[PDB]
Amino acid sequence: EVETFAFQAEIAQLMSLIINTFYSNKEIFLRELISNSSDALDKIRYESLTDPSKLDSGKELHINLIPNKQDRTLTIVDTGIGMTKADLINNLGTIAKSGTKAFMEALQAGADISMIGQFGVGFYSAYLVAEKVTVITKHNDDEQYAWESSAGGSFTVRTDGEPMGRGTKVILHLKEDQTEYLEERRIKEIVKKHSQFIGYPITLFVE
Numbered sequence: 001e002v003e004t005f006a007f008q009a010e011i012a013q014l015m016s017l018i019i020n021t022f023y024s025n026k027e028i029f030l031r032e033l034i035s036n037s038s039d040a041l042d043k044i045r046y047e048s049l050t051d052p053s054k055l056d057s058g059k060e061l062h063i064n065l066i067p068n069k070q071d072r073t074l075t076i077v078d079t080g081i082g083m084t085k086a087d088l089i090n091n092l093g094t095i096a097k098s099g100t101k102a103f104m105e106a107l108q109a110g111a112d113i114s115m116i117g118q119f120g121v122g123f124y125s126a127y128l129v130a131e132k133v134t135v136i137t138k139h140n141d142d143e144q145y146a147w148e149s150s151a152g153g154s155f156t157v158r159t160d161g162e163p164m165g166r167g168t169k170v171i172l173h174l175k176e177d178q179t180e181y182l183e184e185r186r187i188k189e190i191v192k193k194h195s196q197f198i199g200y201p202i203t204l205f206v207e
């Protein structure tokens with residue numbers, strides 16, 4: 001069964017702003033997603049000190065960037081802590097509201113969309129390049145879930161597909177005019193410019 005949820009008003013507004021605003025510096029979405037992967041990897045590295053059994057679902061702590069020109073998708077995979085069904089919906093809850101509002105006000109005060117991550121809502125920058133985002137996640141304490149949204153004020157959640165052990169996979173179904181983010185040289189340049197100091201291996205898969 002598929003569950004359909006409405007985004008909180010501020011999020012639906014933020015997502016419309018991101019989609020409708022003229023903003024050429026779209027490449028910032030990647031830094032935001034990598035930064036989110038990095039935080040999940042730190043959380044699993046930290047929980048594994050006190051409880052080593054939390055790494056039974058996978059020892060390797062890494063980020064994989066997977067472009068697929070046939071499906072027109074860019075996949076960002078990590079082996080971080082992952083998210084429970086509760087983490088999924090709770091992170092699309094009241095926490096994001098304060099950040100969204102502060103970001104919304106900053107933009108009116110002259111800040112630009114590249115500052116989105118400082119407000120903890122960097123994920124939504126994925127809608128600068130993606131017409132639809134699918135998020136597959138697996139936490140040690142729960143089952144595998146698939147979150148999906150093409151914006152429009154709603155998102156869906158369902159029990160997920162091939163098992164992934166532990167972590168989060170972000171599948172960006174790119175807009176027709178955003179296929180440059182499938183090119184090896186373009187992804188390399190962006191990772192080098194914005195994510196050069198990430199404390200985890202970043203493997204750019206080739207096709």
Ligand SMILES: Cc1cccc(Cc2n[nH]c3cc(O)c(C(=O)N(C)Cc4ccc(Cl)cc4)cc23)c1
Pocket residue numbers: 033036037038039040041043078080081082083087088089091092120123135137147167168170
């Ligand atoms: C649909 C959806 C729902 C909730 C949050 C997101 C943001 C997101 N983008 N890329 C990610 C990669 C990840 O490994 C995680 C992850 O599993 N974490 C434990 C770290 C984490 C949690 C909350 C936030 Cl706000 C940021 C990082 C999340 C994200 C997207």
